[PDB]
């Protein structure tokens, strides 16, 4: 009851997971089920080691707020979706009650605030567009995107799909949504090699890594385009079961760590560019 | 039962205007402010009002809080602390919801309840076209003398922000001896270079270096910060109006108050 399971998902540099006996300095023990085979539920939790800015954020909520944890990955899908209205992802098991929260990268929206409860976001995000090279395109509402056709040829973009991103394209912009399926990237490092490469115009996702990604890119060529101009802005949160006893302390938690300066620190420390 | 909404002056958020002869008045609502007398306030917060209002059905009467403040907790004199401004209106139950450009912290955040915020923003610094400085580090603002003055609003977050860091009490300190009543009232005695700097909300600082052409930020957000709705820590409305919050930064009606009012 003052011990907690808690999930959370691989991002950088938001949570990166490390290879392990003892998880070393800065980073702490988050186990992850890997199954044994394709043809059975058999599996084994394999020990590894993560850090990252939302693992600082952890444990500087678990110092204060007084709580232990057992931290363990994601298995079942990402962030989470709702497929056949059953929700999959970290989302998911809050939901389901697997987890008492989840940490990490995670968009807050409408959607999923009606099914779990979220803390006050602690990082600004939203939806922005990068690119490789020079371009005049506005953001997400510039006619190249929302009648592609219009063009010839057509712009070629797309987003890593499941998230709160493509969530968000497909109720807002039904003709883009289905026109940049066939660009659907596999994930964010995919999709920067497309964008170097030049089998992708633009990459829209998620602000807050996307401006980290460019903040970290040697050459400095990706940028996010409108001097990082970000649509539908919101935040990560942490997500809590609906009811949780939890939110008011990891919230007033969070709001005096920025008051500490502790935010900003935790800013520099795994945010700092060198563009 | 009908919803008593307090707000404040705070443009491009909550502009007021006098009634015209009639009693009478871009969308405008009838609010009363200082003894009070009947005026027209209209703006983004207003449009917010108006959205949040038709989307969850509710009426409403707006006023303007009437120490013109914010709001902060001090002392009582002793012992007692007390909120004043836009704080202590709705913990008393002068109102019911604040709708404002209302920062969120720790400090409110133990007695009231935000919505998700309407507006992410942070704290800059506003000053006249011929000043120059590198920002909220400079040598004349860390270590301050009457030769080189800079204020923020009174009973406002930023001065909770310079009170709560023991090595932010030099600053504090200077600030104290000129800190202004109105934001209005500040950026006016910067133009007149009664003022030389303005530390105060970007979105705020920003649209009037944007209109009044002689006034510039500098630089440079130096702090993050967020707008929310203020509740009281019941509410019945308070998960209703998140939700609200979120689904128009979702699908473009923030950002086309945005583009409306800055
Ligand atoms: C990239 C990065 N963005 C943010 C980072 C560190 N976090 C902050 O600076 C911060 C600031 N303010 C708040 C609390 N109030 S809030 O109104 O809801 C708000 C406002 C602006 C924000 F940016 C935000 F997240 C949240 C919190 C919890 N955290 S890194
Ligand atoms: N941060 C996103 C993931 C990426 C995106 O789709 O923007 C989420 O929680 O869904």
Redesign the interface.
Known sequence: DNHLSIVTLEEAPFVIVEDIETCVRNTVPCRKFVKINNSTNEGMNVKKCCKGFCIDILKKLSRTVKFTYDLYLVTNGKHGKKVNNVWNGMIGEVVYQRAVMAVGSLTINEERSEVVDFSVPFVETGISVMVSRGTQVTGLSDKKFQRPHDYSPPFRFGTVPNGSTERNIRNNYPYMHQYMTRFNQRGVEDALVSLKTGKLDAFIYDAAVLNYKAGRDEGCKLVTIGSGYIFATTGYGIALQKGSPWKRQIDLALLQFVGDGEMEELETLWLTGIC | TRLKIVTIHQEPFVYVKPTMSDGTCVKKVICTGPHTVPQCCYGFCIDLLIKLARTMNFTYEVHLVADGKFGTQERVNSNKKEWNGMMGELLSGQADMIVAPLT???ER??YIE?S??FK?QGLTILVKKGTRITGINDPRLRNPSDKFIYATVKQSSVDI?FR??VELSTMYRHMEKHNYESAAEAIQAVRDNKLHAFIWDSAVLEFEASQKCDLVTTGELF????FGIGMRKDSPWKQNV??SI??S????F??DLDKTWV
């Open positions: 969120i912290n720790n955040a133990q935000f998700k915020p992410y922000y709560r860091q702090f993050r910060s967020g998140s939700l979120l689904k930064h979702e699908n473009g923030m950002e």
